[PDB]
Design an enzyme around this catalytic site. Structure first.
Site, PDB file in Angstrom:
ATOM      1  N   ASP A 197      -8.925 -30.835 -45.289  1.00  0.00           N
ATOM      2  CA  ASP A 197      -9.035 -32.217 -44.791  1.00  0.00           C
ATOM      3  C   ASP A 197      -9.454 -33.124 -45.936  1.00  0.00           C
ATOM      4  O   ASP A 197     -10.358 -32.794 -46.711  1.00  0.00           O
ATOM      5  CB  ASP A 197     -10.086 -32.308 -43.694  1.00  0.00           C
ATOM      6  CG  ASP A 197      -9.728 -31.553 -42.426  1.00  0.00           C
ATOM      7  OD1 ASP A 197      -8.589 -31.118 -42.212  1.00  0.00           O
ATOM      8  OD2 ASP A 197     -10.641 -31.490 -41.578  1.00  0.00           O
TER       9      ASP A 197
ATOM     10  N   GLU B  42     -16.605 -38.158 -39.846  1.00  0.00           N
ATOM     11  CA  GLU B  42     -15.675 -37.340 -40.611  1.00  0.00           C
ATOM     12  C   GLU B  42     -16.077 -37.221 -42.088  1.00  0.00           C
ATOM     13  O   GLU B  42     -16.002 -36.128 -42.659  1.00  0.00           O
ATOM     14  CB  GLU B  42     -14.256 -37.898 -40.495  1.00  0.00           C
ATOM     15  CG  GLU B  42     -13.616 -37.739 -39.127  1.00  0.00           C
ATOM     16  CD  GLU B  42     -13.349 -36.323 -38.719  1.00  0.00           C
ATOM     17  OE1 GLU B  42     -13.512 -35.412 -39.556  1.00  0.00           O
ATOM     18  OE2 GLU B  42     -12.975 -36.102 -37.540  1.00  0.00           O
TER      19      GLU B  42
ATOM     20  N   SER C 133      -5.927 -24.657 -44.761  1.00  0.00           N
ATOM     21  CA  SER C 133      -5.642 -26.088 -44.905  1.00  0.00           C
ATOM     22  C   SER C 133      -6.915 -26.801 -45.355  1.00  0.00           C
ATOM     23  O   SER C 133      -8.014 -26.241 -45.287  1.00  0.00           O
ATOM     24  CB  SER C 133      -5.118 -26.675 -43.614  1.00  0.00           C
ATOM     25  OG  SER C 133      -6.107 -26.703 -42.598  1.00  0.00           O
TER      26      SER C 133
ATOM     27  N   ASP D 281      -8.257 -21.806 -41.749  1.00  0.00           N
ATOM     28  CA  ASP D 281      -6.853 -21.417 -41.879  1.00  0.00           C
ATOM     29  C   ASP D 281      -6.273 -21.648 -43.287  1.00  0.00           C
ATOM     30  O   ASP D 281      -5.109 -21.339 -43.518  1.00  0.00           O
ATOM     31  CB  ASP D 281      -5.972 -22.101 -40.804  1.00  0.00           C
ATOM     32  CG  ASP D 281      -5.837 -23.610 -40.989  1.00  0.00           C
ATOM     33  OD1 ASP D 281      -6.416 -24.160 -41.925  1.00  0.00           O
ATOM     34  OD2 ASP D 281      -5.142 -24.249 -40.186  1.00  0.00           O
TER      35      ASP D 281
END
Ligand code: NA
Ligand SMILES: [Ru+3]
EC number: 3.2.1.17
Length: 129
Positions: free
Chosen positions: A52, A35, A50, A48
């Site tokens: 992380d 990640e 958003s 979209d």
């Protein structure tokens, strides 16, 4: 902060993530590797709109507030910037909520695609824990 492999394992264990919801420590270390490459300051914008955040790339669509993700929730009740700290507490606490929400660690797409089913203990092998 960029963690070392064994250093992150130790920090995750201290914060109760080892075997949390049945996921051994190597699962969590593997997920963080793919990640964020163990970098607490990692951020990535999704298509979209958003974003992380942090060592486990927790998404502002559901889990944290960044002020620029319309219609989103803040289920961990934190600013997304808290997920970028050198101290992993906020990320661990929020990850515990996420992994409890029904689909386990499948919530982390990199875990599903790169860790699930593999020898995840190799991520903590050799570490003094
Ligand atoms: Na949000
Ligand atoms: Ru290896």
């Amino acid at each position: 902060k960029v963690f070392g492999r064994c250093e992150l394992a130790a920090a995750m264990k201290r914060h109760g993530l080892d075997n949390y919801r049945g996921y051994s420590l190597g699962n969590w270390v593997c997920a963080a590797k793919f990640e964020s490459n163990f970098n607490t300051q990692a951020t990535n914008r999704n298509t979209d709109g958003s974003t992380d955040y942090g060592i486990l790339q927790i998404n502002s669509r559901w889990w944290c507030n960044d002020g620029r993700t319309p219609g989103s929730r803040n289920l961990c009740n934190i600013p997304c910037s808290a997920l970028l700290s050198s101290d992993i507490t906020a990320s661990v606490n929020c990850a515990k909520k996420i992994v409890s929400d029904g689909n386990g660690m499948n919530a982390w797409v990199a875990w599903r695609n790169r860790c699930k089913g593999t020898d995840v203990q190799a991520w903590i092998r050799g570490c003094r824990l």
